[PDB]
């Protein structure tokens, strides 16, 4: 059992991040005041769970997290929520006055009013862990914080826990639900910073996020709400391997070392299947060859692009539920032969399998129908260069008008910085080129 | 030299003072520095007794200054209605131009004199008449959008 | 990001900011002695961003009240708000400017700035967190344009890190026909470049123009003027006075309005417009709102969008209507007039909706616009200035007050310099 310390920042960390606690604590069977009866050891145990929940001497279990924002409005509502006696009220950090949408003022000015409080907060948690292996920070792309703060975060991070692991969930932004038009700086300038002090990080692009709460949800203007739900559902499939028993994915290193081939192009592709609404209660129970084929379908992906103009380079597929596993070998016998899917030359072929044998567990209120087996593929592909790209001329197209670029250099940064950023994404995207033969 | 204190008196609008200057034979025609005459300062400050005095006494009515303004040029530009008409009575020359091109028409077109406008174009005024960089009174109302400035200027 | 303090300074400073004051109280069910009468939630938690809690239960706002003339300062406790304000916040000098900017800015307004900083320091303190600064003042007289200038210089030298935020009205013949007018604009505007973040231009050519063309008033009045400029102000504070993410405060809206330091003179427009006797005007459709809000006759500015680009629009819509149809309005009028947007900003048109419509209405919207067409107000004062200028016309009454002359040739060349800036990114492409 290895310690693992959540980091949400932002508002779209704090909200993802309490739908994710919200999802944890009922797949645990953890009720809202932190009590857990199937829980046989009381004060303390070294169960797969207590990686994400430490316990106290009367039997509460308190998630391994941390809230931070730089304005207190969203975490006040963590405060009064239903889970607000789940967390400890001094990991729920907030200052005044929020970074206004600015990478600078999250990182430099605004931010470093309140990051050596962040550390210590940290510290406290780190200093309860018997095997402490890494940290997940929840973040956005275009937030002042989610940019600004998180990249500040991540380099103290590698200088006290050089060692640990460091695993991101991002929001890539999206026009549809995007507050800000600075928000491809924002994005190209926290990505230059942490690409360096990050293992691995799972792009959600809310743009993906949106569609498929359109068309397969059928909501027609989906919100914050409905696409937090379904983030937070595949989040869960994601750290389930952390949270149980099982042979794939069990610490923060194999990640790395089973998507991560090399440390730049550490940006998984994550898939989830299936995706049904909750008003088809009576649907037909899609086979385990269904929701296999559905992985490789772009509609379901968590980041806009096609893997079919891209070659993997490794490919795990979590399963939960029914789900025999010589199903599974049948399954992706014949996507091995019928779809052409093309493997990098250098790599084997070949897919890991992991299946959680409990079917998935669907929040009251969400928008989502219990199914009897879901899968939720990770994959390391070259078509995710597509997302950058979209990014990058974003950037181009406004940084040479030098539009908007005074309220960076404003807020004490250099205006270099943009370039150096710029030209690290340039050689990201060769990074990706020069692999996809 | 009475020529300095009728300069004064005229700009300030002291009517007795500019009477009797006049009667101990001060220049009703004096100038400035830069050329402004007694009826150019009675013109621009709306002294209109005033202006009616000095054209009764050989108040040269076209007189120019160093950049070419007329009276009627300052009366146009500040907008006096009233020493407008009495400046066309004795003679102002309507389509006077000064060094930058400027007609009276093209000085009360743009300050939105559109009363002074309307005796301007009843009295001669040139719509044609282009000012150095060859505007003219409709295109000034084109250019700023006036439509109630290019209504008047069609007629 | 939390309180804002207000300032009106002038004639007409004060003439708009005190029915500012009398329609966001209707709004959110402020009484005039300070009493919350409003029977929804919604109107009190963003109350303490122009107001102050007092005794019981009542809220005063935050408004410092500025003029040289003494006349104006009982002007305001006569009218229906007046014994709202604080008495403390009312700092009258002795005798009026008399629409000299350099009485306003050099001498006699010099006197009184000093009282006005000391009642801004005692709001600041008694703030939480402070957003930063908004004031109506008009550019044509000699207090609200030269001591309005004179106190914004002062309060960004003390509180840098805040806002700055003007509601400037533009001066015009049709309204008032005093020749010095565009001398005091001329010099404002030099100001404004300098030490302001956010400025709305209202235009009284285009309040006369509204009242006149389109609403069929003969002799339009100041009060029909200030109908259309307390509906204004009204819609684009929206997302300062109640709960939002879209631009819920001054510094995320100048960082999304704002591409470039000296270019932030908004455009700001409104949809329907009303005349003071609404009687029965039915509610128009969102694609009414829509087409409307982006139409020349409806911009509070003298200036044809269609004649330059946007740089940044943020539109605000109130009252019961469907979010899915917005969305698809404001995408459909980025194509139809795909031309008038620059497409080296991507995503520059931001979309707001209030659930509370302004009184007497049930579907409004607002529109603020950075667009380039904003050149031909700046162009239309600039030859104003000019023909003035060039004849040295009333010159000495500003140098006469210590004004050197040189300073008119710097606020009309670096006037001009705005009005290229403006030509600069109109004309320039995405190659
Ligand atoms: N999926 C999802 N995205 C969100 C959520 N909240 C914000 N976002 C996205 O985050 C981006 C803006 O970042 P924010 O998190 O809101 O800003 P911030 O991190 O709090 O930083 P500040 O500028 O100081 O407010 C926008 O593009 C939003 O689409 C959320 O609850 N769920
Ligand atoms: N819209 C509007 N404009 C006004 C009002 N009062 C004055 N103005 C304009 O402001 C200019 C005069 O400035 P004023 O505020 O009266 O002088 P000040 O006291 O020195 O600031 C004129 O061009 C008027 O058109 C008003 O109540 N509403
Ligand atoms: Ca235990
Ligand atoms: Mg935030």
């Not at chain 1, 409905?226 to 069990?250: E, H, K, M, P």
């Not at chain 3, 309180?3 to 209707?26: L, M, P, R, T, Y």
């Not at chain 3, 009258?92 to 050099?106: E, L």
């Amino acid at each position: 059992m290895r310690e693992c310390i959540s980091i949400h920042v932002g508002q779209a960390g704090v909200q993802i991040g309490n739908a994710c606690w919200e999802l944890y604590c009922l797949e645990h069977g953890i009720q809202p005041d932190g009590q857990m009866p199937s829980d046989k050891t009381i004060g303390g145990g070294d169960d797969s769970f207590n990686t994400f929940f430490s316990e106290t001497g009367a039997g509460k279990h308190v998630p391994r997290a941390v809230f931070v924002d730089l304005e207190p409005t969203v975490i006040d509502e963590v405060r009064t929520g239903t889970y607000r006696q789940l967390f400890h009220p001094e990991q729920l950090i907030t200052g005044k006055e929020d970074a206004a949408n600015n990478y600078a003022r999250g990182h430099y000015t605004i931010g470093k009013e309140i990051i050596d409080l962040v550390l210590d907060r940290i510290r406290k948690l780190a200093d309860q862990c018997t095997g402490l292996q890494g940290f997940l920070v929840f973040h956005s792309f275009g937030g002042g914080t989610g940019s600004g703060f998180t990249s500040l975060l991540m380099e103290r991070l590698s200088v006290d826990y050089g060692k640990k692991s460091k695993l991101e969930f991002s929001i890539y932004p999206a026009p549809q639900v995007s507050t800000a038009v600075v928000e491809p700086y924002n994005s190209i300038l926290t990505t230059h910073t942490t690409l360096e002090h990050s293992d691995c990080a799972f792009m959600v692009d809310n743009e993906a996020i949106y569609d498929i709460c359109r068309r397969n949800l059928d909501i027609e203007r989906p919100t914050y709400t409905n696409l937090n739900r379904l983030i937070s559902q595949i989040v869960s499939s994601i750290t389930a391997s952390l949270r149980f028993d099982g042979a794939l994915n069990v610490d923060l290193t194999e990640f790395q070392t089973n998507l991560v081939p090399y440390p730049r192009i550490h940006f998984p592709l994550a898939t989830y299947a299936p995706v049904i609404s909750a008003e088809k209660a009576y649907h037909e129970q899609l086979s385990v060859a269904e929701i296999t084929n559905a992985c490789f379908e772009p509609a379901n992906q968590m980041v806009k692009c096609d893997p079919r103009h891209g070659k993997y380079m490794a490919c795990c597929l979590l399963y939960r539920g029914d789900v025999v596993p010589k199903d599974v070998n049948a399954a992706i016998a014949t996507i091995k032969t019928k779809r052409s899917i093309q493997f990098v030359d250098w790599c084997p072929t070949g897919f890991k399998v992991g299946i959680n044998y409990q079917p998935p567990t669907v929040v009251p209120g969400g928008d989502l129908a219990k199914v009897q087996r879901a899968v939720c593929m990770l994959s390391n592909t070259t078509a995710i260069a597509e997302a950058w790209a979209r990014l990058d001329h974003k950037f181009d197209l406004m940084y040479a008008k030098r539009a908007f670029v005074h309220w960076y250099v404003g807020e004490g940064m250099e205006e270099g910085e943009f370039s150096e950023a710029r030209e690290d994404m340039a050689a990201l995207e060769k990074d990706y080129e020069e692999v996809g033969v | 030299d009475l020529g300095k204190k009728l300069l004064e008196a005229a700009r300030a609008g002291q009517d007795d003072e500019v009477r009797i200057l006049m009667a101990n034979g001060a220049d009703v025609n004096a100038t400035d520095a830069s050329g402004l005459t007694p009826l150019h300062l009675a013109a621009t400050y709306g002294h209109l007794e005033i202006v009616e005095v000095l054209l009764k006494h050989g108040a040269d009515v076209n007189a120019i200054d160093i950049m070419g303004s007329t009276p009627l040029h300052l009366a146009a530009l500040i907008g006096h209605l009233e020493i407008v008409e009495v400046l066309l009575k004795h003679g102002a020359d309507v389509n006077a131009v000064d060094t930058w091109g400027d007609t009276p028409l093209h000085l009360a077109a743009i300050m939105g004199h559109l009363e002074i406008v309307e005796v301007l174009l009843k009295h001669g005024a040139d719509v044609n008449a282009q000012d150095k960089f060859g505007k003219t009174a409709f295109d000034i109302s084109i250019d700023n959008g006036n439509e109630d400035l290019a209504e008047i200027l069609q007629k | 990001m939390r309180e804002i303090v207000h300032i009106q300074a002038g004639q007409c400073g004060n003439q708009i900011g005190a029915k500012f004051w009398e329609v966001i109280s209707d709004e959110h069910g402020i009484d005039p002695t300070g009493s919350y009468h409003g029977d929804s939630d919604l109107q009190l938690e963003r109350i303490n961003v122009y107001y102050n809690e007092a005794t019981g239960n009542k809220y005063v706002p935050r408004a410092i009240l500025v003029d040289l003339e003494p006349g104006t300062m009982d002007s305001v406790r006569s009218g229906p708000f007046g014994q709202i304000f604080r008495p403390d916040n009312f700092v009258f000098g002795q005798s009026g400017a008399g629409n000299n900017w350099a009485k306003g800015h050099y001498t006699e307004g010099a006197e009184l700035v000093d009282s006005v900083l000391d009642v801004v320091r005692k709001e600041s303190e008694s703030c939480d967190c402070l957003q930063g600064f908004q004031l109506t003042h008009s550019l044509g007289g000699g207090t609200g344009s030269g001591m309005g200038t004179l106190l914004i210089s002062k309060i960004r030298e003390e509180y840098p890190d805040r806002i700055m935020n003007t509601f400037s009205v533009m001066p015009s013949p049709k309204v008032s026909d005093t020749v010095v007018e565009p001398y005091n604009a001329t010099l404002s505007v030099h100001q404004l470049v300098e030490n302001t973040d956010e400025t709305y231009c209202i235009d009284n050519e285009a309040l006369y123009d509204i009242c006149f063309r389109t609403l069929k008033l003969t002799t339009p009045t100041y009060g029909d003027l200030n109908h259309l400029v307390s509906a204004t102000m009204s819609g684009v504070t929206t997302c300062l006075r109640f709960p939002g993410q879209l631009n819920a405060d001054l510094r995320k809206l100048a960082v999304n309005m704002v591409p470039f330091p000296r270019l932030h003179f908004f455009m700001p427009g409104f949809a329907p417009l009303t005349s003071r006797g609404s009687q029965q005007y039915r509610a128009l459709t969102v694609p009414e709102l829509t087409q409307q809000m982006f139409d020349s006759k409806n911009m509070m500015a003298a200036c044809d969008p269609r004649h330059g680009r946007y740089l940044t629009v943020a539109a605000i819509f109130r009252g019961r209507m469907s979010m899915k149809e917005v969305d698809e309005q404001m995408l459909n009028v980025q194509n139809k007039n795909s031309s008038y947007f620059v497409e080296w900003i991507p995503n520059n048109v931001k979309t707001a909706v209030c659930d509370i419509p302004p009184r007497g209405l049930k579907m409004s919207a607002t529109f603020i616009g950075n667009s380039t067409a904003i050149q031909e107000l700046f162009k239309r004062i600039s030859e104003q200035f000019t023909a003035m200028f060039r004849r040295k016309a009333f010159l000495h009454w500003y140098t006469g007050e210590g004004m050197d002359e040189m300073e008119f040739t710097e606020a009309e060349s670096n006037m001009n310099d705005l009005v290229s800036e403006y030509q600069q990114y109109q004309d320039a492409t995405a190659d």
